[PDB]
């Protein structure tokens, strides 16, 4: 009423992530698999550094 | 060290694992040290007059 715009109230802050899904969790697994790939060939005596 | 690395490039092309390459130089390095320790002669039996000359042999080599 005090302004012609009447902005719609966002729940969270701008730049605050929104996260619902059967996925979402798949990205966390793929993120762990990514870090797991770097430490993968370093196993055992015949590995690498 | 570059000579060991340059010769290791050809062996990586053949598909040898790097640990077998590294273990080979470790056994070869100790074997070469064990041979060179036997063949070299001792100079402590000589007197001080000749021991000064051995320093002159190495001094002219380093300068």
What does this molecule look like?
The structure is cut from a larger assembly and holds chains A (49 residues) and B (63 residues). Chain A is mostly helical and 49 residues long. Helix content of chain A is 29%, strand content 0%. Chain A is rod-shaped and about 75 Å long. In chain A, 0% of the residues are buried. With 63 residues, chain B is mainly α. In chain B, 79% of the residues lie in helices and 0% in strands. Chain B is built from three helices and no strands. Chain B is elongated, with a radius of gyration of 19 Å. Classes of the chains: A mainly alpha (49), B mainly alpha (63). At the A-B interface, loops of A face loops of B. Chain A: It comes from Saccharomyces cerevisiae (strain ATCC 204508 / S288c). Chain A: Heterooligomeric complex of about 850 to 900 kDa that forms two stacked rings, 12 to 16 nm in diameter. Chain A: This is T-complex protein 1 subunit eta. Chain A: Belongs to the TCP-1 chaperonin family. Chain A: Molecular chaperone; assists the folding of proteins upon ATP hydrolysis. Known to play a role, in vitro, in the folding of actin and tubulin. In yeast may play a role in mitotic spindle formation.
